[PDB]
Amino acid sequence: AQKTGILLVAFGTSVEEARPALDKMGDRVRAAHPDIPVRWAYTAKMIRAKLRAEGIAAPSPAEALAGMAEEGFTHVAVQSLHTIPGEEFHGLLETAHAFQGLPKGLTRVSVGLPLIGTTADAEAVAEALVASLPADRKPGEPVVFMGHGTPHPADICYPGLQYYLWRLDPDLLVGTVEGSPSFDNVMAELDVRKAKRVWLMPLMAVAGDHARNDMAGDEDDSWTSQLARRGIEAKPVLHGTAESDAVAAIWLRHLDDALARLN
Amino acid sequence: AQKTGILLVAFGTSVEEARPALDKMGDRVRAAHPDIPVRWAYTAKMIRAKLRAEGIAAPSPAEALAGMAEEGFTHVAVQSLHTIPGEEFHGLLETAHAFQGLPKGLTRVSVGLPLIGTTADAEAVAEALVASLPADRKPGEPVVFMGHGTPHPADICYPGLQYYLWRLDPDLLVGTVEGSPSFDNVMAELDVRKAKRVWLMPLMAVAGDHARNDMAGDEDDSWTSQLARRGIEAKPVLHGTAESDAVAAIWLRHLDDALARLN
Amino acid sequence: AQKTGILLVAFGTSVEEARPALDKMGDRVRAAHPDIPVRWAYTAKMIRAKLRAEGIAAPSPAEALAGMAEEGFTHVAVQSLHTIPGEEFHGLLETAHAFQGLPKGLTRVSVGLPLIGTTADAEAVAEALVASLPADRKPGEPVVFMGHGTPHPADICYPGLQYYLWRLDPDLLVGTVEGSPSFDNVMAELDVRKAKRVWLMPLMAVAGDHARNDMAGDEDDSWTSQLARRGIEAKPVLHGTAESDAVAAIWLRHLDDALARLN
Amino acid sequence: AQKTGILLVAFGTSVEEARPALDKMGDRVRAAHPDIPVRWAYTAKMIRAKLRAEGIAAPSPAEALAGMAEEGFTHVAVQSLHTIPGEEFHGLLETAHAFQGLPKGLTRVSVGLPLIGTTADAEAVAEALVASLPADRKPGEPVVFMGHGTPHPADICYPGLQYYLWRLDPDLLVGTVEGSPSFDNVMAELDVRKAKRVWLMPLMAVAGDHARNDMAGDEDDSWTSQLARRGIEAKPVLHGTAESDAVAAIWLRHLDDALARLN
Ligand code: HEM
Ligand code: HEM
Ligand SMILES: [O-][O-]
Ligand SMILES: [O-][O-]
Ligand SMILES: [O-][O-]
Ligand SMILES: [O-][O-]
Ligand SMILES: [Cl-]
Ligand SMILES: [Cl-]
Ligand SMILES: [Cl-]
Ligand SMILES: [Cl-]
Ligand SMILES: [Co+2]
Ligand SMILES: [Co+2]
């Protein structure tokens, strides 16, 4: 009776200018698995709420998998587009396990690792980030990658990643909105380097509200505003990591592993 | 943040003439719990399929509970309108347990017992069945109650119930379409009683397709057709047990117990 | 790495005169599966406590399965010698599921049905009980089988069984210490039959404390004492059903099904 | 009926010279919770096997918790003395969850975080490691901390920790036997620093076989042997991190959090 499906799961975005990076990921998946149905879900409640408000279907992972059981899928590979295996990724794993083996439902539900899975992923991410840098960035000019940050233990992925980036370039820095390293830590790194021009790039899949507001906003407490007050030319780049082929390739490999775990 | 909901779950029916017994149960629940939201789900895949085909929303228990988590419910009392704790009732229990405690989802999901829960329910069902008999049934005229039957061990509820019915009336008989006692067992009971007029009543919540076709159909292998060939005046009664107040009261008590199990 | 084991689980007994029926079951299992290791566990806490007090190892199902994981077993078939799928049997099922698939532990843990599993088992039990009757019991003399009884819904197995027994012999009766039918129900059955000699047989695997005390005790409230006060010659028979080959054969078949469910 | 217990879980050691660090942890726990029973278990199969071979009881976490359920404990706080939340720590979490809520068993089983739990733990570990250094280590002399390493994603804790250590001292280095950073990575760090005297300290709770053999062994492929071949005075220090009060204090705090999670 066998039927295989793929569930792509993003934190998500509700802003029109940011959704293209999701669609680009959808194409990549379709191109690599032309005969497997692909469905979407979103882990953030507030974003499902805004998307429904605009008249767009936006299922939670639970709704998506109940709907997929209803369409007769038996084996589903779930791939998050999270960066780290934090709270949301763990919740997604609990949700997948809960659906597998329910009566008359899904036989097998596998979950692909987020971006920074193994130490080998972390080193591959560092390389992909380097390959993603804007052509106009000059050698010596620091780049701050902005991650979300979390109180979850997987926060340790950000300082782990900083290790790998430095092995490539002493001027590539990691900062987070809510964890460690903090933006203050990043500014202290910038002061010792006496950098005059600094690039800012989101570490998340899509350049969402943290990217547009906390990293590059007009208000005083944004990263670019804070850098301007200390005389630094801030160059924010509003592209999520899902726009990079070299980064996306790592999510794709994770999806391949999850499909293979279905048998 | 607390919010309590009730999920009523029927095997279900897709035939217009049979759905009124479901609506009657919905009223009873509303009348007994005027301030608790009440939602519906259906355990039979083929029936969800026919209802969707007619343009009617018919969620599986999984879809229903994912939707309810999405509306912000935290504590849900699930009540099946199954007759016995067989395969479908067990699947419903697995499905409820799977949803409870998922991240950002339902805190507590309780499940009410089907009709024949304890031996005290079984005795109460026997009494309610007796109270439900048509006024025109005469003393001495046998009544055959038709249950579904199952290969599941809960099939033992049918012969258990027969025990309780006989304590009340030697001429009340239990038969099933797919289990034990069989219709052949019932006919052998009828032969020793030399009964000339026999009543047939569904044991299920709604007088569905088994009631209209297997019990009372025009075709040769229906119960009434088989009784007519042996010279018995068959009186089929097309009312599910959900139409009886005395029977419905037992499902209601089960729902009260399940609400109390939420705290 | 594969290694298959069998876990036999009894409610248990702590009285020397009753343990032989367990040993007889152990032989039967060894004889039918000569190359599979067989281990024991007991569901009753008070009995594990008395056996430890006498210096006898008596593991709970949890201790047994943790020990078996430790010896390198990978696939274990658990067979209860319970009569009905009540509270204890359900707890055993939860305990088996909990062990299967734990890291570096058991791959597969299956559970065999108790005696009264399907309606087909129930009919086979009725036949086996009849075959087990003492040769001196005369036709027409009632036999009361004593079951435990439980508030669990599986109590419905006792009146279910009574149905099957009556199909064979109108004078075979089922009574229970704690459920339905009650001993009062049995005495009302005896009064209408005006029986002068009545046989009492335990329905449980071993003739334990309920058999020696509640059924056949010297005190006033025992079954035999109550029957003597109403002028009935009570003939108690202190053999658990595990002593009968015809009954044991049903547990053995259940164990075969559970072994096959391992693959 | 309430009864609270503490389960201390070590990877473990089977070598006499190394077990004192476990006993020191046992005292610390007893001293901080004088009225709570404390039990031991070990996650490594090969070590349970060697300890049983020497006649010492060495239960797996499953055996321990089944035994504790048997003694009447209801609420158990499990604390691993693992360094990272890798494969073994995850297995321990699965095992604890499996025991909680089993019939007549443990009501609540909580699990304390391993050493490197949050980014705040990671920074506290870095500080504790610094405080643990031998008094004879001179400023400027590098120290290599040896961790296990794992293919599990929690391997990212080692490069995460390296980040925190460097914030304190550019000459503190992290290396692992089986993950990243590798010993080759550490030697390349040593070459750029042209270090003549290097200290080696185990990162694990006990200075076990990896410490005595892979880090400080006489054979050619040991860390100290490899450093001697390149003209470096290697100073191995055979004390597990459990010997340090400043490090142990972090495990103790984790145990406090796990006790509080019992209510
Ligand atoms: C007449 C036979 C059976 C009856 C009357 C019955 C009834 C029930 C009921 C009423 C519950 C509610 C849970 C509770 O009391 O806490 C339950 C739970 C459950 N049942 Fe059944 N059941 C039967 C046979 C089985 C069988 C054959 C299986 C497995 C093959 C099974 C598996 C379970 C499981 C896994 C649960 C939830 C946790 C637990 O084991 O208590 N039951 N059952
Ligand atoms: C750096 C990577 C990882 C870290 C730091 C980590 C850490 C943790 C921690 C600290 C917990 C405690 C539970 C809680 O917070 O409530 C946890 C729970 C859990 N973890 Fe991990 N983990 C990682 C990767 C993984 C992976 C790859 C898997 C699966 C393959 C996994 C599976 C689980 C599961 C099933 C639980 C229990 C329920 C849940 O999903 O929250 N973790 N993990
Ligand atoms: O986090 O907003
Ligand atoms: O059963 O149709
Ligand atoms: O039940 O004793
Ligand atoms: O790892 O030995
Ligand atoms: Cl310039
Ligand atoms: Cl007439
Ligand atoms: Cl005589
Ligand atoms: Cl010197
Ligand atoms: Co945020
Ligand atoms: Co049917």
Ligand SMILES: [Co+2]
């Ligand atoms: Co008892």
Ligand SMILES: [Co+2]
């Ligand atoms: Co090792």
Ligand code: NA
């Ligand atoms: Na991020």
Ligand code: NA
């Ligand atoms: Na029925």
Ligand code: NA
């Ligand atoms: Na019994």
Ligand code: NA
């Ligand atoms: Na380590």
